[PDB]
């Protein structure tokens, strides 16, 4: 066959389309992903037949699926389907624009090539949100306020078109434009940033110009007017204008004035909030729906000065001497700017540019060129040597940190980062039974091997040893070898003697302890494990207890001041299938028999609707501080972020806004919940100064999301300032977006680049020995610290300490004497609209 890579991939695309076709043919209403697969396959298939032109297929592709053949969100999510195929005249790109345009598709075309029977239209079974929609006040913003302004008539004397962008220095324009150049001096177009004015040959247009600001220095263009704006340079400029034959005509009566907040000022340019949000993403007071959830984030503040947005592209702001600075030392250029980001972080929901430098978040604020813009700090300068990542219309969050990882296989790593996880903490050696059961890398030789093994992967890693020992001796060894924590597990013994010894070791090494308690109550009840803590900081894994712990009341630890409690993700949130699914999973994990009374009694003591219901409420009120995966050992590595948001959405639907919430937005609840997979894991494990939030000085581990896929499938995952993984389409295609679009590894995964972007977290004892040198590690190593004086009060926005009781017979859970109930949800968002399977 001699298949090239693209042929192999297109076969894959075609198989997804055929799955979508079979589903269509029995009357399924296709989700977004199925609809793309089908339309894109059908375009390839029509191309194979050789009878349809590109222009014909642009039309045919909008006839394939009707509103009634797809889910209600599809016409909203789906703007275009692109694919390339071999026509009789070679590879061509087809874009099918707005493909869901009719009520009913031409199902014979939708099914063309499939040989499937065409279903009758009544087979498709009969209100819905717009995922990621932007809500805006009906209002206009005023651009470039507080500047000198002039209106000039500009005539083209050219025989070819001339188009001039918002931030081009107007005196430097093409000599074949004629206008008052003296009055254009130090001025630029008063138009939306990144837009342009077009002059066809011979046209006259009046334009409004406003003065450049900041230090007011002109650079670049034709070097007509190069230099700081002042009288001497104005004269030199006009001399060059005449000398060089640039068109000039005095316009003695050109109106002059200022821009001001005033809807009647003839110098003003205005832009409606709706269009401002389409161009730049939204600004203060606007709201954003997160994915297809019910949660609304309001922008709390915006660093932008309207009119001076850093937008990159042809005609646009980020160009030599315009938005791109010519007046600063080379060493202070940013490495990268992410322009116009909506930042969602536990510190706030804001709108800002993000400066990246040496792999770090260098600055958050207003970026660009101090020579023509106000408000640009000297750590947010965009220079020749700066890359641009376009954040307009996107949300940017910290990368997620999963601190309950079982290192069972390498493939969960890939699964984790393609979902927005950039830091893994846990243990394991691969799929050994010890690892399948517990987050433990037991042997110093395995700690070495795991660190060498993961050294080129672009994520930060922490490995935990086996803390289940009554003696300190071996624990010192695994910690010196590189352990940044220890994980006590009932499967190796979580008895009071092990607990206490392990904690004493933690006190000495300044590492965090993670515990899965004694389910069996063999050595004690939960109050006896709490007594063995002796007041010392400890992290309780899966605190609700389905994933493990004192039956049935381990969840009591959520009221214990020196406990940092996490949830694992598969109980998040309580839904219709949760209990059946979890009971059987437990029986599978434990090799239990439904026909043995004691086995079934064991399982029922462990899988409990009431504690799991309580766990929804505890998360919501901030009494559980972290969500984590338990990857392949009861939980799901790619669902840390989506389970978090599904819990918030559930609690909002059932209990309404939090106390602390406003009633126009869900900001407080959003900040509380994002903290669960960002900052709190980093605090708990002792590395919050490096990662876990969008804050200056930290690693630029950042994730980009479309609001419509927020919480489910990110656009791109940035690791230490470089793209590590991202959605990208057919590698052979003319552009990056034609099908199949898949999450794929990027340059941050090749060679040893991964190590240059990341940190392996180890203990102090290990770094004092320079384990990184001993082990020939290319990844940076840092020691975890400051984890032995933590309490629940240090968990950001999840510092609640209700007194928790659990009836030992009925399992009823109460917090400060009140029932913790929530019914099961029958559906969750961030699922059916997005997943192919």
Active site residues: 590
Using the contact rule CB under 8 A, the part of the chain among 62-70, 342-350, 368-376, 571-579 near its own copies is 571-579
Question: In angstroms, rounded to a whole number, what is the distance separating the alpha carbons of residues 167 and 143?
Answer: 13
Interface residue with its own copies among 74, 618, 723, 820 (CB under 8 A) is: 723
638 scored as a contact of its own copies (CB under 8 A) = yes
Question: In angstroms, rounded to a whole number, what is the distance separating the alpha carbons of residues 22 and 117?
Answer: 9
| Shortest distance (Å) from residue 31 CB to its own copies | 9
CA dihedral sign of residues 402, 407, 410, 411: negative
Interface residue with its own copies among 472, 600, 782, 785 (CB under 8 A) is: 472
Q: Judge contact between 356 and 362, C-beta under 8 A.
A: yes
Q: Judge contact between 617 and 651, C-beta under 8 A.
A: yes
Among F ion, Ni ion, its own copies, none, what binds residue 472 when CB lies within 5 to 8 Å by partner kind? its own copies
| Shortest distance (Å) from residue 329 CB to F ion | 29
DSSP 471: S
CA angle in degrees (0–180, nearest 5) for 770-771-772: 85
DSSP 74: H
Among F ion, its own copies, Ni ion, none, what binds residue 695 when CB lies within 5 to 8 Å by partner kind? none
Question: In angstroms, rounded to a whole number, what is the distance separating the alpha carbons of residues 166 and 391?
Answer: 19
Long-range contacts of 475-478 (CB under 8 A, 24+ apart): 475/501, 475/502, 475/505, 476/505, 476/509, 476/765, 477/444, 478/441, 478/442, 478/443, 478/444, 478/447
Q: Which of residues 382-421 bind its own copies (CB under 8 A)?
A: 383-390, 407-412, 414-415, 418-419
| Shortest distance (Å) from residue 631 CB to its own copies | 8
Q: Judge contact between 327 and 676, C-beta under 8 A.
A: no
- Write the interaction track for its own copies spanning residues 346-385; mark x where CB under 8 A is met and - where it is not: ------------xxx----------------------xxx
431 scored as a contact of its own copies (CB under 8 A) = yes
Using the contact rule CB under 5 A, the part of the chain among 44-52, 424-432, 539-547, 673-681 near F ion is 539-547
Q: Please tell me whether 630 is known to bind a ligand.
A: yes
Q: Which residues precede chain breaks (C–N over 2.5 Å) in the chain? A: 126
- Write the interaction track for its own copies spanning residues 199-228; mark x where CB under 8 A is met and - where it is not: -xx-----------------xxxxx--x--
Question: In angstroms, rounded to a whole number, what is the distance separating the alpha carbons of residues 503 and 94?
Answer: 63
547 scored as a contact of F ion (CB under 5 A) = yes
| Shortest distance (Å) from residue 309 CB to Ni ion | 24
Task: Please name which of 677, 462, 668, 438 lies closest in space to residue 566, comparing C-alpha atoms.
Answer: 677
| Shortest distance (Å) from residue 239 CB to its own copies | 17
82 scored as a contact of its own copies (CB under 8 A) = yes
Q: Please tell me whether 76 is known to bind a ligand.
A: no
Q: Which of residues 577-616 bind its own copies (CB under 8 A)?
A: 577-578, 580-581, 584-585, 588-590, 598, 601-602, 605
DSSP SS3 for 717: strand
Nearer of residues 154 and 551 to Ni ion, judged by Cβ: 551
Q: Identify the H or E element spanning 339.
A: strand 336-345
457 scored as a contact of its own copies (CB under 8 A) = yes
Q: Please tell me whether 406 is known to bind a ligand.
A: yes
| Shortest distance (Å) from residue 404 CB to F ion | 6
Secondary structure (DSSP) of 307-322: T-----STTSSSSBTT
Nearer of residues 581 and 661 to its own copies, judged by Cβ: 581
Residue-wise burial string across 263-274, b where 16 or more C-beta atoms lie within 10 A, e elsewhere: eebebbbebebb
Question: In angstroms, rounded to a whole number, what is the distance separating the alpha carbons of residues 409 and 710?
Answer: 27
| Shortest distance (Å) from residue 437 CB to F ion | 8
| Count of residues that interact with its own copies, criterion CB under 8 A | 254
75 scored as a contact of F ion (CB under 5 A) = no
Q: Please give the torsion angle defined by the CA atoms of residues 261, 266, 271 and 273, in that order, rounded to the nearest 10 degrees.
A: 40
Q: Which of residues 240-299 bind its own copies (CB under 8 A)?
A: none
By residue count, the chain amounts to: 837
| Count of residues that interact with Ni ion, criterion CB under 5 A | 5
Interface residue with its own copies among 126, 159, 261, 595 (CB under 8 A) is: 159
Q: Judge contact between 794 and 683, C-beta under 8 A.
A: yes
444 scored as a contact of its own copies (CB under 8 A) = yes
* Distances, alpha carbon 204 to alpha carbons 55, 207, 796, in Å: 36, 10, 60
Q: Please give the torsion angle defined by the CA atoms of residues 575, 581, 585 and 586, in that order, rounded to the nearest 10 degrees.
A: 60
| CB-nearest residue to Ni ion | 516
Cis peptide before 383 (omega within 30 of 0): no
Q: Please tell me whether 591 is known to bind a ligand.
A: no
Task: Please name which of 390, 227, 382 lies closest in space to residue 318, comparing C-alpha atoms.
Answer: 382
Question: In angstroms, rounded to a whole number, what is the distance separating the alpha carbons of residues 89 and 53?
Answer: 10
321 scored as a contact of its own copies (CB under 8 A) = yes
Interface residue with its own copies among 290, 403, 484, 741 (CB under 8 A) is: 741
| Shortest distance (Å) from residue 305 CB to its own copies | 22
Q: Which of residues 608-647 bind Ni ion (CB under 5 A)?
A: 630, 633
114 scored as a contact of its own copies (CB under 8 A) = yes
Cis peptide before 676 (omega within 30 of 0): no
Among Ni ion, F ion, its own copies, none, what binds residue 654 when CB lies within 5 to 8 Å by partner kind? none
| Count of residues that interact with F ion, criterion CB under 5 A | 4
Interface residue with its own copies among 128, 163, 655, 786 (CB under 8 A) is: 163
| Shortest distance (Å) from residue 227 CB to Ni ion | 31
Q: Please tell me whether 487 is known to bind a ligand.
A: yes
Nearer of residues 332 and 801 to its own copies, judged by Cβ: 332
466 scored as a contact of Ni ion (CB under 5 A) = no
Interface residue with F ion among 71, 96, 634, 767 (CB under 5 A) is: 634
Task: Please name which of 821, 801, 803 lies closest in space to residue 811, comparing C-alpha atoms.
Answer: 821
Question: In angstroms, rounded to a whole number, what is the distance separating the alpha carbons of residues 69 and 427?
Answer: 46
Interface residue with its own copies among 63, 92, 157, 182 (CB under 8 A) is: 92
| Shortest distance (Å) from residue 778 CB to its own copies | 8
| Shortest distance (Å) from residue 440 CB to its own copies | 8
Q: Judge contact between 630 and 568, C-beta under 8 A.
A: yes
Interface residue with its own copies among 78, 192, 551, 800 (CB under 8 A) is: 551
Phi, psi of 252 (to 5 degrees): -55, -35
Among F ion, Ni ion, its own copies, none, what binds residue 22 when CB lies within 5 to 8 Å by partner kind? its own copies
DSSP 439: S
Q: Please tell me whether 539 is known to bind a ligand.
A: no
630 scored as a contact of F ion (CB under 5 A) = yes
Q: Which of residues 539-558 bind Ni ion (CB under 5 A)?
A: 547-548
Q: Which of residues 514-533 bind Ni ion (CB under 5 A)?
A: 516
514 scored as a contact of its own copies (CB under 8 A) = no
Which residues make Cβ contacts (< 8 Å) with residue 788, sequence separation at least 6?
A: 506, 507, 510, 536, 537
- Please state, as a whole number, how many other Cβ atoms lie within 10 Å of the Cβ of residue 797: 20
Nearer of residues 522 and 816 to its own copies, judged by Cβ: 522
Place of tokens 């799955």: 19
804 scored as a contact of its own copies (CB under 8 A) = no
44 scored as a contact of its own copies (CB under 8 A) = yes
Structure tokens at 86: 């071999």
Phi, psi of 768 (to 5 degrees): -60, -30
Task: Please name which of 398, 425, 835 lies closest in space to residue 630, comparing C-alpha atoms.
Answer: 425
Nearer of residues 21 and 665 to its own copies, judged by Cβ: 21
Per the annotation, binding residues are 404, 406, 487, 489, 516, 542, 630
Binding site per annotation, positions for substrate: 489
Residues at the contact surface with F ion, assessed by CB under 5 A: 547, 630, 633-634
Binding interface with Ni ion (CB under 5 A): 516, 547-548, 630, 633
Q: Binding site for Ni(2+), residues? A: 404, 406, 487, 516, 542, 630
């Amino acid at each position: 066959m001699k298949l090239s890579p693209r042929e192999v991939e297109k076969l894959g695309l075609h198989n997804a389309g055929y799955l979508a076709q079979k589903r269509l043919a029995r009357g399924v209403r296709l989700n977004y992903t199925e609809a793309v697969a089908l339309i894109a396959s059908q375009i390839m298939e029509y191309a194979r037949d050789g009878e349809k032109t590109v222009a014909q297929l642009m039309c045919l592709g909008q006839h394939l699926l009707g509103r009634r053949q797809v889910l209600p969100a599809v016409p909203h999510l789906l703007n275009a389907v692109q694919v390339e195929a071999t026509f009789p005249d070679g590879t061509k790109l087809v874009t099918v624009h707005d493909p869901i345009s009719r009520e009913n598709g031409e199902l014979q075309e939708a099914l063309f090539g499939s040989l499937l029977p065409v279903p009758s239209l009544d087979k498709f079974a009969e209100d819905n949100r717009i995922p990621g929609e932007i809500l805006c006040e009906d209002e206009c913003l005023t651009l470039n306020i507080g500047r000198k302004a002039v209106i000039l008539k500009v005539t083209s004397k050219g025989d070819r078109p001339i188009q001039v962008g918002s931030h081009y220095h107007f005196i430097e324009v093409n000599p074949y434009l004629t206008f008052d150049r003296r009055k254009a001096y130090g001025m630029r177009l008063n138009i939306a940033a990144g837009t342009a004015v077009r002059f066809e040959p011979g046209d006259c247009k009046s334009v409004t110009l406003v003065s450049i600001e900041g230090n007011k220095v002109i650079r670049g263009g034709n070097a007509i007017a190069d230099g700081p704006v002042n009288e001497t340079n104005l004269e030199a400029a006009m001399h060059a204008v005449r000398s060089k034959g640039f068109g000039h005509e005095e316009e003695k009566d050109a109106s002059e004035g200022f821009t001001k907040e005033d809807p009647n000022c003839p110098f003003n340019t205005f832009i409606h909030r709706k269009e401002y949000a389409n161009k730049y993403g939204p600004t203060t007071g606007d709201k954003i729906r997160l994915g297809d959830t019910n949660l609304l984030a309001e922008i709390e503040k915006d660093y932008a000065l309207y009119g001076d947005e850093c937008v990159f592209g042809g005609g646009k702001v980020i160009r030599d001497g315009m938005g791109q600075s010519c007046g600063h030392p080379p060493a202070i250029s940013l490495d990268t700017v992410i322009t116009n980001a909506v930042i969602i972080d536990y510190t706030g929901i804001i709108k800002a540019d993000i400066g990246i430098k040496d792999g770090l978040i260098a600055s958050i604020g207003k970026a660009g060129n101090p020579d023509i813009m106000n408000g640009v700090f000297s750590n947010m300068i965009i220079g020749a040597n700066t890359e641009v990542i376009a954040g307009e219309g996107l949300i940017v969050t910290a990368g997620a940190i999963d601190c309950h990882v079982h290192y069972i296989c390498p493939q969960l790593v890939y699964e984790a980062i393609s979902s927005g996880i950039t830091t893994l903490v846990g243990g394991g050696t691969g799929p050994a039974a010890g690892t399948r059961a517990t987050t433990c890398t037991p042997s110093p030789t395995q700690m070495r091997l795991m660190l060498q093994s993961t050294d080129d992967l672009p994520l930060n890693f922490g490995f935990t040893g086996k803390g289940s020992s009554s003696k300190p001796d071996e624990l010192h060894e695994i910690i010196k070898a590189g352990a940044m924590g220890l994980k006590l597990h009932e499967d190796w013994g979580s008895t009071p003697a092990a607990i206490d010894n392990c904690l004493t070791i933690a006190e000495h090494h300044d590492i965090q302890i993670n515990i899965h308690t004694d389910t069996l109550n063999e050595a004690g009840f939960v109050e006896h494990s709490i007594a063995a803590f002796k007041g010392r900081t400890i992290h309780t894994y899966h605190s609700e207890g389905a994933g493990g712990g004192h039956a049935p009341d381990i969840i009591k630890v959520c009221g214990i001041k020196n406990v940092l409690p996490s949830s694992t993700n598969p109980t998040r949130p309580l839904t219709s299938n949760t209990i059946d699914e979890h009971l059987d999973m437990l029986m599978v994990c434990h090799h239990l028999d439904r026909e043995i009374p004691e086995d079934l009694a064991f399982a029922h003591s462990r899988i409990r609707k009431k504690t799991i219901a309580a766990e929804d409420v505890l998360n919501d009120i901030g009494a559980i501080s972290i969500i984590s995966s338990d990857s392949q050992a009861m939980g799901r590595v790619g669902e840390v972020i989506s389970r978090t948001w599904q819990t918030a959405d559930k609690m909002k639907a059932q209990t309404g806004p939090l106390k602390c919430d406003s009633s126009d937005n869900d900001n407080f609840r959003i900040r509380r919940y994002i903290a669960k997979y960002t900052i709190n894991p980093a605090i708990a494990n002792g590395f919050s100064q490096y990662v876990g939030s969008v804050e200056v000085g930290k690693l630029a581990d950042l994730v980009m999301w479309k609001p419509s896929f927020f919480g489910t499938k990110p656009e791109m995952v940035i690791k230490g300032g470089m793209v590590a993984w991202a959605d990208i389409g057919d590698p052979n295609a003319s552009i990056p977006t034609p099908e199949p679009v898949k999450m794929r590894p990027m340059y941050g995964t090749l060679g040893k680049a991964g190590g240059a972007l990341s940190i392996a977290f180890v203990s102090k004892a290990a770094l004092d020995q320079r384990v990184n040198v001993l082990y020939g590690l290319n990844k940076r190593v840092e020691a975890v610290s400051n984890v032995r004086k933590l309490t629940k009060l240090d968990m950001k926005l999840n510092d609640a300490l209700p007194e928790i009781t659990v009836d030992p017979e009925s399992y009823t859970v109460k917090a400060d004497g009140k029932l913790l109930c929530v019914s099961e949800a029958t559906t969750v968002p961030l699922s059916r609209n997005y997943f192919l399977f």
